[model samples]
Target: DVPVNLYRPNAPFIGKVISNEPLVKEGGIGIVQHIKFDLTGGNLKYIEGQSIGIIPPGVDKNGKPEKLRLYSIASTRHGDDVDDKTISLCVRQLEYKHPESGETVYGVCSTYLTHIEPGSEVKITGPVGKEMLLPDDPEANVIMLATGTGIAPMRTYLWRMFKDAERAANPEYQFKGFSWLVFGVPTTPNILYKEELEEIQQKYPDNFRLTYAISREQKNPQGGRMYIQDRVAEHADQLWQLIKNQKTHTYICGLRGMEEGIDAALSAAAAKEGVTWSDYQKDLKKAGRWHVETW
Candidate 1:
């Protein structure tokens, strides 16, 4: 395959993190941190829809913060100073072992974030990732689906969406159409930020609906572990109604392997309604009603 960098010119680096607070720095997994940076020219201005990539320094043979990879920024503009900003990244560390040395290896950036001291300096750059961009039309309804740290950008979007509604005193300024969230996790113990999400649902009752899919929880008549695809499938009638109405949008983020399941569920549901496969597929694709991120 051709390299992605081949088509696009490299962007410039603008800043570095000078300090950070380790939120969960351990075992090379469940690592989260908040970094503070002073930009080269000034602070980078980022919206709820944008992301920032930190180029991590590679590590030595011994486990350390050495090599770097870009991570998505989770914080929004309203939450911080848009120009002089402190961005947040919700990160999860993946641990594996090297085959040759039989030594454990951890993620580059996340592990670096795990050990950095107050005065440590590192290269940080641009607000990136356009997958979660805000709509051009402010009145457009927004839907988000995420598992674990994927909830970051959605929270940023909600901050802007609700801040506007509060100022206007019109609840409709919030996502005007139906806003749905389907989050899946391995177990209930691993469910993150539940209370905060519930508050958003309760406060925006007319605009948003949140659903949880715990794969390890008790099976719900489907005779298998419940997942986001399953929950979205179970509510197919409602989702189908929204799609058929021609005014709904969907966003999804989580681990791989679930997209096929969601597609299967959607196709099967439509089939039960006597809709032909070709017709249903054409409609969803043409309408741009489906979006997903798996990594």
Candidate 2:
């Protein structure tokens, strides 16, 4: 059963920051970190596709305490240490220019998380959410779509399915099926966990496929910036065929805006076979084969 609010906001578990490492290199984009927390002295547990809330230190201008912000777990149940005593998150600082002042404005939670010192205690709550969980069958075809920090949950999925250490820990499940990831980033260096992903893909060439849409450095068929939707449209035919398979599961996680474009691309592809994409998607949703988690 999926765990829901095991740790509530009222009584958040205090987790320590064990490690904070950068996921992006210089000149890639904005700041992004892969932070791991120590989960010792607590009974908190989580699966691959869940999230935890972090309450930023201090209050707002009105003096009310800061609210907790949910971040997807970037590590598997075994965690980054391959031990159950840790949890990780892929966080990108929400930096933007203020409208009125034309000065920099930073996201409270993100700024707090991205800068927290190692060994510091942080308030954490709820390993929440259930939509992004992996299928029970290890032989299921997993189609993953992600952008920026949306790669958090997808990382755990790939880790469990392909990592040798993870395979040994999850003896009951062994992935024998295929997984394809369509990741979108601004540049090559902005691709999080690039080396690790490519290493697994190289060894499991038949089972793992990786496609990148680098907007600034790549172009779509129409000579426009290569966004995720462009890649979806480019592979709509193949994706439509895959969607027709009973064992295939599709997971899309990113900004909510990308939702409409993804649906539109698939609709056109389904039309080629005299099928209604909306109706078909409804069935997939009912069966839990079509999953989306956007922020």
What is the C-alpha lDDT profile of model 1 across 1-295, one tens digit per residue?
A: 1111211114444454556654332322255555556554654566555556666665567876543355555555533334334656666666678878888777766766656665556565566555556554555666677776666666666655654433344233445656777777666645555665678788889877888888777576759887777787788767666656455666666666766776676677678788864577566556665555556
Question: lDDT for each of the candidates?
Answer: 0.61, 0.92
| Pairs in steric clash, model 2 | none
* Model 1 TM-score on a 0 to 1 scale: 0.75
lDDT of 2 by residue, 192-246 (tens): 9999999999999999999999999999999999999999999999988988989
> Could you tell me how far off, in angstroms, the CA of residue 83 lies in candidate 1 after the best superposition?
7.4
Question: Model 2 — TM-score against the truth?
Answer: 0.98
Which stretch of 10 consecutive residues in model 2 shows the poorest summed lDDT? 254-263
Tally clashing residue pairs in candidate 1.
Answer: 8
- The Cα RMSD of model 1 versus the native structure comes to 5.6
